[PDB]
Amino acid sequence: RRQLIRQLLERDKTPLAILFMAAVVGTLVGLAAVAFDKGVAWLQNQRMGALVHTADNYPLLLTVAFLCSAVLAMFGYFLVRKYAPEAGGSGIPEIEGALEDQRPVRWWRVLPVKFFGGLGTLGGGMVLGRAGPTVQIGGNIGRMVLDIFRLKGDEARHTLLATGAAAGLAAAFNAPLAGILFIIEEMRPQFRYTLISIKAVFIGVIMSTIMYRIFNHEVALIDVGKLSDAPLNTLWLYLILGIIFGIFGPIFNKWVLGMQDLLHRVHGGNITKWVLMGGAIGGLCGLLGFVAPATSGGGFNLIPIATAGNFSMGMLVFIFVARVITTLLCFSSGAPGGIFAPMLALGTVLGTAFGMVAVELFPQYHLEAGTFAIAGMGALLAASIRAPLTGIILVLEMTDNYQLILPMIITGLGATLLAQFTGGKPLASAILARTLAKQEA
Amino acid sequence: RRRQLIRQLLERDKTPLAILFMAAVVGTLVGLAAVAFDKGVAWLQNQRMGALVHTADNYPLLLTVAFLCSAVLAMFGYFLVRKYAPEAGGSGIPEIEGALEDQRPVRWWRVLPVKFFGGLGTLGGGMVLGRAGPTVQIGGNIGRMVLDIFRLKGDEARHTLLATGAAAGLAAAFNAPLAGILFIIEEMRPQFRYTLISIKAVFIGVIMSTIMYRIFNHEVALIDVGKLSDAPLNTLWLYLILGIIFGIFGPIFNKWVLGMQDLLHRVHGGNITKWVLMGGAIGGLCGLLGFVAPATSGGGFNLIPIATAGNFSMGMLVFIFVARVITTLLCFSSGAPGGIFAPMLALGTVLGTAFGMVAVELFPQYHLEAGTFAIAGMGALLAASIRAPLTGIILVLEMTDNYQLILPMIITGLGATLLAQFTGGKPLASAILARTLAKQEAEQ
């Protein structure tokens, strides 16, 4: 008690030094995120144009696509294996590690690797997001400033590493709330207190978001329009859908993990059979980007189209299966790139389909399939990485259908609920667990 | 250590099945409780407004019945608290904050009836007070009461079920489920050590109570503001400036609440008779003003839409601000059962509007609309006195749904907290607990 009183009166006083530094961090992460984001676009572009000039005939071009993505894949798989192996896959597991002080931040290596790395895997049209990359790139930026300014302390090492990963997510999805929420719900050391300063993370998020806005305003990443509302007599349906995502979250967790192992064999850890295999997956993606594009790519492309109930039943299920596959390959293959976006895409597609069925089971509800899409869009994020608060808010800032806030809060929650009563676990933590264990062994 | 981590990591996100289901029962009751209160407060304002109409001819007889009604209700409310439950005075957020620190008892057998019927009286009578304060505390106690009835044991349950009560408490208060959760995990919680509070459990509670609220209030909001215009990039600095204003004002407003709290203790010296009489006068004043100048009484929800829309004169906004500062201090410092959270939205709004006004005519090349500044400012004083920026920001978003105003809102609050921090302001919740918590030793 007597101590507490002493603390209360002392609460919320973050050293201006950390504060001013939080600003620069975000600013950097922002610009960087912008820079990443422009690069990827550029590469998807040339792949487009080089098919234009070789429009024929089937094969001349089914192949130039394959190569282009294969050749970009390999550049990426190589850049990781050779100079920064810890910059493979997501980036989140890693940085979560760093927040525990159970991994290091080799920023002078990771920056170039991930960035020019992802530039390749992303740009070549692989099933993988910007999120991992930029969240990772983000902490490293935050680290690089700690180093350059000889900042020392736990708080300061913890906070600056923290803000760059928030401001890295912020600038990735243009979601400044979800940026902050992620740190305080997931990223952070999960089992003990931490000296992360909220006030600082905000500032970073702000500044990187602004940077994103200075170069991407005048277009949302996802347009969905304002969907219909949701009658109270309609809510149980959102619980059901949550329950499905609740069983499937863990199952998809198994496969992501398992598929990592079953993919380690095809090179046994060997930099050459890896870069060549990744080169093959990459090639597969740049092919699919042209013969079935909904199955390949990041998949933001198909959220709008799914939400508008534009796919038939068949095309939805196909896309879902097809993506369950390609997502596994691209992520489990250790290639640098997040699984966050492609999960949004799975949740969306799943959502719609679930909707479609309800629409015709109950014309009395005047349902629109599209509201189940938006409920499900974050539901996978909720069942598999288990950080629902962050997914719910991620979709919120991203779709602006605030009136669906109950259905979305319910679907998400009923996913995190069955994902716990089927024994799944935070896929981000299952991955950090994997790393740390195959290390003291 | 690395081996415990891997141990712990693999074990994450398992909340005991009992704890979850009991957070559901908590959520459900917190919501119904909130709705019941919500209605009881409405009915009173109504009887009151209609008694003035049995007497809408004889002006002095009218100015009398207005006053007396609020007086009779204020007194009854102060009384209940002074007589059966001192902890149910003022907001209730500081107290529930105490209980999370295990520094303050949750005497739910006492507070539930005193806070509920107490607030019913003070809110009912027209006094400048909120629901949040009271429903969050009632929320908490409802949680404790289910903990006790079911004797769920051990740290997780006592904090979780106390925390879900508080968040289901706030959610139904403003129909803001996300706000309630972000309130617990940013502000309510023990600020300096880890805690065994289940997030997922707080969620279930929130969902339940928000649904109870919706069953009784679907259709109308609490605040309708429509979809205001966007903020262009070149405009953002004005929100930062506005932030800095909320930032220096923030702390200063905390000082007067504390100051006033003292000076008000003098008038009754702590006497249960001078108190109940002093409350009856402040209350009676409010029910009067709630006629002659309604903008200066009431909780503040009514004038939000009016100010945001730009239907007030710069003259009237200055007037409202002064007057409400005075009625807000006078009611809350006085330690009537009631919160200061809602009134803070109002003062925040009015100021933002007024800023916007001046901002509009200084920069036509911006094509401003003073009403974006009202929204930015509505959550800014909760940022600069309560220091719950994330909670205010999200509460406002939930309430006025102008998502495209998100940056200017963030910047405003974040600017306000920064000036509030650097100028020496103290989280008004924390600073109120600290006094309560200290005086309990001091008296020794």
What is the 3-class SS of chain B, one letter each residue?
A: CHHHHHHHHHHCCCCCHHHHHHHHHHHHHHHHHHHHHHHHHHHHHHHHHHHCCCCCCCHHHHHHHHHHHHHHHHHHHHHHHHHHCHHHCECCHHHHHHHHCCCCCCCHHHHHHHHHHHHHHHHHCCCCCECHHHHHHHHHHHHHHHHHHCCCCCHHHHHHHHHHHHHHHHHHHHCCHHHHHHHHHHHHCCCCCCCCCCHHHHHHHHHHHHHHHHHCCCCCCCCCCCCCCCCCHHHHHHHHHHHHHHHHHHHHHHHHHHHHHHHHHHHHCCCHHHHHHHHHHHHHHHHHHHHHCHHHCCCCCCHHHHHHHCCCCHHHHHHHHHHHHHHHHHHHHCCCECECHHHHHHHHHHHHHHHHHHHHHHCHHHCCCHHHHHHHHHCHHHHHHHCCHHHHHHHHHHHHCCHHHHHHHHHHHHHHHHHHHHCCCCCHHHHHHHHHHHHHHHCC
Which amino acid type is present at position A265? R
User: What is the rounded distance in angstroms from the CA atom of residue B181 to the CA atom of residue B131?
Assistant: 17
Task: State whether B410 and A198 contact (CB < 8 Å).
Answer: no
Q: Which two tokens stand for residue A249?
A: 């979250």
CA angle A416-A422-A424, nearest 5°? Answer: 65
Residue A293 C-alpha, separation from nearest chain B C-alpha, in angstroms = 31
Task: State whether B8 and A191 contact (CB < 8 Å).
Answer: yes
CA angle B213-A412-A388, nearest 5°? Answer: 105
3-class DSSP string for chain A: CHHHHHHHCCCCCCCHHHHHHHHHHHHHHHHHHHHHHHHHHHHHHHHHHHHHHCCCCCCHHHHHHHHHHHHHHHHHHHHHHHHCHHHCCCCHHHHHHHHHCCCCCCHHHHHHHHHHHHHHHHHCCCCCECHHHHHHHHHHHHHHHHHHCCCCCHHHHHHHHHHHHHHHHHHHHCCHHHHHHHHHHHHCCCCCCCCCCHHHHHHHHHHHHHHHHHHHCCCCCCCCCCCCCCCHHHHHHHHHHHHHHHHHHHHHHHHHHHHHHHHHCCCCCCHHHHHHHHHHHHHHHHHHHHHCCCCCCCCCCHHHHHHCCCCCHHHHHHHHHHHHHHHHHHHHCCCCCECHHHHHHHHHHHHHHHHHHHHHHCHHHCCCCHHHHHHHCCHHHHHCCCCHHHHHHHHHHHHCCHHHHHHHHHHHHHHHHHCCCCCCCCHHHHHHHHHHHCCCC
> Which of chain B's residues have a Cβ under 8 Å away from the Cβ of A440?
2-3
Q: Which of B6, B390, B421 lies at the smallest CB-CB distance from A180? A: B390
Residue B334 C-alpha, separation from nearest chain A C-alpha, in angstroms = 22
Task: State whether A11 and B398 contact (CB < 8 Å).
Answer: no
User: What is the rounded distance in angstroms from the CA atom of residue A33 to the CA atom of residue A37?
Assistant: 6
Closest residue in chain B to residue A410, using alpha carbons only: B207
Yes or no: say if B388 and B382 are a contact pair by the CB < 8 Å rule. Answer: yes
Residues 6+ apart with CB under 8 A from A430: A253, A257, B9, B10
Q: Which of B10, B192, B417 lies at the smallest CB-CB distance from A425? A: B10
Yes or no: say if B172 and B135 are a contact pair by the CB < 8 Å rule. Answer: yes
Residue A162 C-alpha, separation from nearest chain B C-alpha, in angstroms = 16
Yes or no: say if B178 and B394 are a contact pair by the CB < 8 Å rule. Answer: yes
> Which of chain A's residues have a Cβ under 8 Å away from the Cβ of B192?
4, 7, 11, 193
Task: State whether A5 and B437 contact (CB < 8 Å).
Answer: yes
Closest residue in chain B to residue A15, using alpha carbons only: B422
How many domains does the structure of chain A reveal? 1
Size of chain A, expressed as the number of residues it contains: 441
- The dihedral formed by the CA atoms of A55, A57, A62 and A68, expressed in degrees to the nearest 10: -40
Task: State whether A437 and B194 contact (CB < 8 Å).
Answer: no
Q: Which of B2, B177, B233 lies at the smallest CB-CB distance from A436? A: B2
Closest residue in chain B to residue A427, using alpha carbons only: B10
Q: Which two tokens stand for residue A256?
A: 């992501």
Residue B13 C-alpha, separation from nearest chain A C-alpha, in angstroms = 7
Yes or no: say if B360 and B332 are a contact pair by the CB < 8 Å rule. Answer: no
Among A401, A319, A285, A361, CA closest to A44: A285
Size of chain B, expressed as the number of residues it contains: 444
> Which of chain A's residues have a Cβ under 8 Å away from the Cβ of B387?
12
Range of the domain at A330: 1-441
- The dihedral formed by the CA atoms of B44, B50, B51 and B53, expressed in degrees to the nearest 10: 160
Q: Which two tokens stand for residue A441?
A: 């062994």
Among B428, B412, B422, CA closest to B246: B412
Query: Please, what's the largest Cα pairwise distance for chain B?
Result: 81
CA angle B413-B415-B421, nearest 5°? Answer: 100
Residue B429: alpha-carbon gap to chain centroid:
11
Q: Which of B5, B233, B434 lies at the smallest CB-CB distance from A436? A: B5
Residue A264 C-alpha, separation from nearest chain B C-alpha, in angstroms = 22
Yes or no: say if A329 and A75 are a contact pair by the CB < 8 Å rule. Answer: no
Task: State whether B214 and A232 contact (CB < 8 Å).
Answer: yes
Measured from the Cβ of residue B154, the count of other Cβ atoms closer than 10 Å reads 10
Among B101, B149, B126, B93, CA closest to B287: B126
Among B88, B89, B91, B52, CA closest to B70: B52
User: What is the rounded distance in angstroms from the CA atom of residue B167 to the CA atom of residue B210?
Assistant: 10
> Which of chain A's residues have a Cβ under 8 Å away from the Cβ of B438?
5
> Which of chain A's residues have a Cβ under 8 Å away from the Cβ of B433?
8
Q: Which two tokens stand for residue B340?
A: 């200061």
Task: State whether B236 and A210 contact (CB < 8 Å).
Answer: yes
> Which of chain B's residues have a Cβ under 8 Å away from the Cβ of A400?
403-404
Task: State whether A386 and B13 contact (CB < 8 Å).
Answer: yes
Q: Which of B206, B207, B433 lies at the smallest CB-CB distance from A8? A: B433
For the domain that residue B244 is a member of, what is the CATH number? 1.10.3080.10
Task: State whether A2 and B441 contact (CB < 8 Å).
Answer: yes
Residues 6+ apart with CB under 8 A from A107: A140, A141, A143, A144, A147
Task: State whether B433 and A406 contact (CB < 8 Å).
Answer: no
> Which of chain B's residues have a Cβ under 8 Å away from the Cβ of A178?
none
Measured from the Cβ of residue A219, the count of other Cβ atoms closer than 10 Å reads 7
User: What is the rounded distance in angstroms from the CA atom of residue A378 to the CA atom of residue A173?
Assistant: 13
Among B148, B155, B151, B134, CA closest to B15: B155
CA angle B183-B184-B189, nearest 5°? Answer: 130
- State in Å, rounded, how far the first CA of chain B is from the last one: 44
User: What is the rounded distance in angstroms from the CA atom of residue A390 to the CA atom of residue A135?
Assistant: 14
Task: State whether A232 and B218 contact (CB < 8 Å).
Answer: yes
Q: Which two tokens stand for residue A76?
A: 């990426």
Hey, which residues does A129 pair with through a beta bridge?
Answer: A338
Among B265, B255, B15, B55, CA closest to B157: B15
Q: Which two tokens stand for residue A304?
A: 């709008």
User: What is the rounded distance in angstroms from the CA atom of residue A437 to the CA atom of residue B2?
Assistant: 9
> Cα-flanking dihedrals φ and ψ of residue A54, to 5°?
-115, 35
Resolution in angstroms comes to 2.8
> Which of chain B's residues have a Cβ under 8 Å away from the Cβ of A431?
none
Hey, which residues does B130 pair with through a beta bridge?
Answer: B339
Closest residue in chain B to residue A433, using alpha carbons only: B6
Evaluated on CA atoms B426, B429, B432, B433, the torsion sign reads negative
Yes or no: say if B142 and B100 are a contact pair by the CB < 8 Å rule. Answer: no
Among B367, B340, B287, CA closest to B64: B287
Task: State whether B398 and A405 contact (CB < 8 Å).
Answer: yes
Among B420, B356, B350, CA closest to B388: B420
Q: Which of B9, B389, B394 lies at the smallest CB-CB distance from A429? A: B9
Residues 6+ apart with CB under 8 A from A118: A36, A40, A76, A128, A130, A133, A336, A337
> Which of chain B's residues have a Cβ under 8 Å away from the Cβ of A436?
2, 5-6, 9
Pairs across A and B, CB distance < 8 A? 161
Q: What angle separates helix A198-216 from helix A154-173, to the nearest 10 degrees?
A: 30
Q: How many Cα atoms within 13 Å fall on the side-chain side of residue B72?
A: 8
Task: State whether B437 and A4 contact (CB < 8 Å).
Answer: yes
User: What is the rounded distance in angstroms from the CA atom of residue A354 to the CA atom of residue A335?
Assistant: 32
Residues 6+ apart with CB under 8 A from B292: B63
Closest residue in chain B to residue A406, using alpha carbons only: B207
- Residue A412 burial by CB count (10 A; 0-12/13-18/19+): exposed, middle or buried? buried
Query: Please, what's the largest Cα pairwise distance for chain A?
Result: 81
Distances B204 to A351, A409, B13, B200, B207 between C-alpha atoms, Å? 22, 9, 14, 7, 5
> Which of chain A's residues have a Cβ under 8 Å away from the Cβ of B97?
none
- Residue A232 burial by CB count (10 A; 0-12/13-18/19+): exposed, middle or buried? exposed
CA angle B410-B415-B418, nearest 5°? Answer: 125
User: What is the rounded distance in angstroms from the CA atom of residue A78 to the CA atom of residue A84?
Assistant: 10
User: What is the rounded distance in angstroms from the CA atom of residue B211 to the CA atom of residue B247?
Assistant: 36
User: What is the rounded distance in angstroms from the CA atom of residue A354 to the CA atom of residue A238?
Assistant: 10
Residue B376: alpha-carbon gap to chain centroid:
17
Yes or no: say if B165 and B147 are a contact pair by the CB < 8 Å rule. Answer: no
Task: State whether B398 and A397 contact (CB < 8 Å).
Answer: no
Distances A261 to A264, A266, A357 between C-alpha atoms, Å? 5, 9, 36
User: What is the rounded distance in angstroms from the CA atom of residue A99 to the CA atom of residue A112?
Assistant: 21
Residue B127 C-alpha, separation from nearest chain A C-alpha, in angstroms = 30
Residue B74: alpha-carbon gap to chain centroid:
19
Choose, out of A5, A8, A92, the residue to mutate when testing the contact with B (most B CBs < 10 Å).
A8
Distances B287 to A313, B55, B157 between C-alpha atoms, Å? 61, 15, 42
Yes or no: say if B133 and B104 are a contact pair by the CB < 8 Å rule. Answer: no
Among B77, B74, B78, B95, CA closest to B139: B95
Q: Which two tokens stand for residue A291?
A: 């013969």
Yes or no: say if A120 and A97 are a contact pair by the CB < 8 Å rule. Answer: no
